[PDB]
């Protein structure tokens, strides 16, 4: 079969022909229908050889949908043609995290060396892929995959940040959402759709900020050093109830802090080597919380598909095929992809 | 009347003579029965001149319980005689925040100008205080004063920070105490009546320490650069589901970052001026949230109360006059009580 | 002043001519702008002499809206001309329910012979009214009065029964909303302002049924005896997570007890005197929990003051001056009124 | 080997010598440490014909705890000698519920024909137990297996129970439980490790009341007419935050509804056919919720066990051998069992 992995540290990805796998007992195998790109895929392809730990080589592609194709020995309650999303982030399954479907908290993947697909374990973005177990599998239905795909992370990421605070974000609560990419133009029709929250986007990229409009923000107002004040006009001086930073840089947290209500919220979801919160006293307000969430839980992963079926998001998004997957990177790389790259295999 | 007051920068606070007040309409004049030493009076007393806005004389004391004295105009839910605790972080009444008893959230009262009792306006270090409003008032029938003053901050304040992350503590959780001080001897009692935590507490000084086991704690750590190691050893590598760190210095927020569970919480309740936690990906596990909370809510100090009448808090006192109020502050700074200090007024 | 009052057991309420009201110490008087008429107060009216409790004569008009007129001694916080809405259940101020905001849930009120205005109390169907406290004025801006009157309990009590299981009602969730009257009617615009649940709505009436849909809901369902299988034909046999019951009467609590889904909710909001739940095993789904909410908290008024304020409800109503108050109630009884009847004096 | 079976209806239920088992893929084979009865066991064999539905035979027991004695093909993540509880309430897996750890709100397994053991599957009440997939062991390590038994249901259930309004449940709050047997034995002592309610207890046996004093009850008085205003001058007008009614009867029932609190719960366990709450207005304060909760979760059950490693349990038990069964279900209907009664191999 056809697939894009990394294969050597610091080079691009490249498409390869490597054997269709087989599935062993317990394993699904899935004919991909479609599998997204994601800005944590460039972070993962430029960590010098001394900090990655994933194996070469690596099948990218750790937002994947697709249909059943295959079912391992022993596997019950999906049928061959079925259209499942893929649940990323592997667990034990036998934790008290695990127990409550938050295998993202599982508390004994690395020692068990569980890792996600795409990010340790074979990737979506290839004709096939094996799935560990059927419960990593959700039923999508007559989802568009193209549209779905993204729905397992893009979806799912901004989706778990956005439910950890979801009570606090009631009528008259901002909720700010800094990056208007892939994860961040998906975070603002979560908003919507599960909250009474003003909704105030904030990018470098005035395109973006015209597809934070396009998908629903109430105010959407440039990066940078300006940002603080002019989300402060808005919020009239009680700051943003949360802030969902899809960037993490420091100077987005920075923001954040200067904007955050006092028992408000800073979601730090992005990631940028170094960055952090300053959570200390006269350094933030009193009671705003602070923290990095990771991915989502199986029981949000059905939410978000069922919000994708209900109508409520838009994904944007940009169609590739496998020979492109490289090409497609580059093109994340540079920013010019409006909203999520997705690779759409034969 | 007699009172202890901060009177002249960089000074230490002296033993006053002044008027006894009278209640305007609203306000209610207490009988002091008792008033807690906190070290935030020590931070307050060494602000340097630029820094410090609270006014100058200022009556100390914002852990205050007394009797009704004298009812103001139109005060009628108090009888005179009656016990009462003061609620400290006095809010606008109006907000949402305040709305729900979090007066110590209240986004209007730094506009208004309203400060706490002892932190801006007159305190209980007194023969007699003021309260602004009856619904500062709490009653504690006939708990001991002495034992109650404490309550209302010592109480209070880890009670609000436990209870900003209580269901996370069920059976099987670990809670850490760092610094088992006035707080910090409460906040041990408190994880074991409202939780079932097992609480590890920690401290520079074997004494306190002792204090630690005899009112709760599980195991004792001794603090500094050995204690992550030991923590670890204690909670088997999963780390602690919560940190309240009721010290608040760079190391003791490290060490908390360096022990604090995946998905869990690091409250930073104590306040050492530019220490910070540092929250951002790599620097703490996915999903642990951080906070500096502050004091707590009407509702919680009734909770707390509750707690006290319940016979499920032993607060541990040394009992000062008037006169001895300054020496009591000595006594603080060179860390000599063994729990609160408390000034009982002739 | 002109005022519209129950004055005889069993006879129509009438216009009266009574003086205007002087506020005394704390209280506030209103010039009134609009006075909601509630389904409640046909039920009052309806009540015989031996049950009736709540005084002759009695001022109408438990949904309040106007501008501040006169302020009594010491009250702060509001200007002569401040347009407000009145919290009506009011509370002692003092328990720790209402420390919370929660007046609705006072456990003293009742001793204290505390009571709502329009139920009790003198009421807002009149030129002029008293409300009693600071406390129990919502500032509403520049909201139209006539549309914000039915916010003080046609949106709150909606408000507080969703809000007490608003986390069960996430996307792929069912809502029912029983009854689309003037309750109703902004109950299915709460749950679509604040939820992603889809909103099924049930009446006798198809006028009501087309209102529903004008106001957001998914699906309209005649009610009686095949509203329950209509419903389950809908929700594909899990059955409905919430059903809000704004009628009340046996046979609509039957039906929400034949569709509610295990682990999911009914709420019996719509008062019919005799009327119950069954709640027992083989009589309801297991985990379906039932109870009867009452009118809603202080910090809940404010949510629904700002969700008007965003334009998240279109609150239907009708306009009738003092002089045709009996008429509307007339109107009301025959149920002619489409949503929510606002007198609106002079 | 050896196992107790419900065989004929209307019976006692009978030792019999039937096939020990052998695990099929995804099936884990336990040996048998402690298998406990539940009143449940009454209610069904109670069932007449035309409603009992779980098939013939069945090998009683659905409180099972044992150590792995035979992996099926392909199962990870457990060794043989492994000492393991067995959670119930067999769910699909799959759903929003099961996804959740929630099986016992599992909106697919009637559908799919999936029940729990002892209650449609072999039970535990046998030398040797299949349970169908590794999610449904919970380690308990070096736990007593006799005292452990009983936590996966007389414990979990109240666990479960109570977990639904822990928040209410803060200080000053008062929690009152009716019936202090099996579940209500063990429920005082959750409430004690979990929360700051004082606890009133109520049975109608004195012994009873003296078993919920010596496991940490506050007050205990005694069921009946009385009750209610016992209850009321205990908790001084307000009435009771939470009422977990571990019976289930109209009468408990009532008095339940005559002592919750405004903005409390009623939370109806016990089950005896018929008997409902009447949750309607002027007959319940405004605010109380009234709930039939159902066994628990996969999280729960791990809480349960993590209280008993800790010491906070005290599981009252009566160990009979599995000759003993039917006597033991004897001496449970005449409530001659001080806790819970527990069948070792
Ligand atoms: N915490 C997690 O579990 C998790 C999961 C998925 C992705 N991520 C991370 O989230 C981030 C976003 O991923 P993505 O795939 O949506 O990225 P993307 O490349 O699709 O989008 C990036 C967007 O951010 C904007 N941006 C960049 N710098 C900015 C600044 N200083 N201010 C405002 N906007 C700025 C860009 O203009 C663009 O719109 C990445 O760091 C990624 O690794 C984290
Ligand atoms: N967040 C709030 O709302 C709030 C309210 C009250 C007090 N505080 C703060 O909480 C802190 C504690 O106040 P207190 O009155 O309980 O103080 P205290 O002086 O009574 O107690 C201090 C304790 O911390 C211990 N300690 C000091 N350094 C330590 C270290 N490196 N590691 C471990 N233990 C150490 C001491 O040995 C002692 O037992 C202070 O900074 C105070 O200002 C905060
Ligand atoms: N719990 C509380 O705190 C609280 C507060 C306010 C009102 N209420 C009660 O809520 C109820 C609704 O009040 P409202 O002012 O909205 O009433 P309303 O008269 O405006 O509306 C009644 C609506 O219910 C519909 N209806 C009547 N019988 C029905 C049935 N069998 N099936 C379906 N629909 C039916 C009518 O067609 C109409 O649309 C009343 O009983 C009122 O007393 C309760
Ligand atoms: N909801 C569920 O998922 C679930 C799970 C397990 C058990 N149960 C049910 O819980 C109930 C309790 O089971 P058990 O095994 O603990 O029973 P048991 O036979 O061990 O205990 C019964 C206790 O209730 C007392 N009692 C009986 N009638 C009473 C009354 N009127 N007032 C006060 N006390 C009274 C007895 O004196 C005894 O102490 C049963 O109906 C059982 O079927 C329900
Ligand atoms: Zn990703
Ligand atoms: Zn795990
Ligand atoms: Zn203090
Ligand atoms: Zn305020
Ligand atoms: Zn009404
Ligand atoms: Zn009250
Ligand atoms: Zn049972
Ligand atoms: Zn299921």
Same mark, same amino acid.
Request: proline content about 6%; glycine content about 14%; some cysteine.
């Given at each position: ?56 080589? &690596? *099948?990218?592609? @750790? ?7 295959? =079912? %391992?020995? +022993?596997? #019950?309650?999906?049928?061959? !043609? ?73 979806? &799912? *990421?901004?989706? @778990? ?7 606090? =974000? %009631?009528? +008259?609560? #901002?909720?700010?959402?800094? !990056? ?74 920075? *923001? ?13 979801? +992005? ?76």
């Amino acid at each position: 079969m056809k697939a894009v992995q990394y294969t050597e540290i610091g080079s691009e990805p490249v498409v390869v022909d490597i054997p269709t796998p087989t599935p062993g007992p317990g394993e699904i195998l899935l004919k991909v229908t479609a599998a997204g790109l994601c800005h944590s895929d460039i972070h993962v392809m430029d960590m010098p050889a001394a900090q990655y730990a994933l194996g070469l080589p &690596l *099948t990218l592609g @750790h937002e994947g949908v697709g249909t059943v194709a295959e =079912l %391992g020995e +022993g596997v #019950t309650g999906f049928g061959v !043609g079925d259209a499942v999303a893929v649940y990323g982030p592997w667990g034990c399954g036998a934790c008290h995290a695990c127990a409550r479907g938050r295998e993202n908290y599982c508390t004994r993947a690395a020692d068990l060396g569980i890792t996600p697909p795409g990010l340790g374990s074979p990737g979506s973005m290839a004709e096939y892929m094996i799935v560990d177990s059927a419960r990593h599998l959700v039923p999508i239905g007559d989802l568009d995959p193209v549209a779905a795909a993204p729905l397992t992370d893009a979806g &799912l *990421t901004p989706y @778990h940040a956005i439910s950890r605070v979801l009570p606090l =974000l %009631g009528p +008259g609560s #901002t909720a700010v959402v800094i !990056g208007v990419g892939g994860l961040g133009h998906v975070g603002i029709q979560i908003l919507r759709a599960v909250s009474a929250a003003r909704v105030i986007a904030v990018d470098l990229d005035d395109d973006r900020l015209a597809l934070a409009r396009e998908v629903g923000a109430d105010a959407a107002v440039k990066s940078g050093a300006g940002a603080a004040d002019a989300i402060r006009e808005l919020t009239g001086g009680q700051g943003a109830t949360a802030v969902f930073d899809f960037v993490g840089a420091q100077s987005t947290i920075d *923001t954040a802090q200067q904007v955050v209500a006092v028992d408000g919220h800073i979601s730090v979801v +992005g990631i940028h080597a170094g960055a952090h919160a300053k959570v200390g006293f006269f350094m933030i307000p009193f009671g705003a919380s602070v923290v990095t969430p990771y991915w989502g839980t199986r029981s949000e992963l059905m939410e978000v598909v069922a919000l994708a079926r209900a109508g409520r998001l838009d994904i944007h998004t940009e169609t590739f095929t496998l020979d492109e997957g490289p090409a497609a990177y580059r093109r994340l790389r540079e920013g010019s992809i409006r909203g999520r790259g997705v690779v759409v295999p034969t």
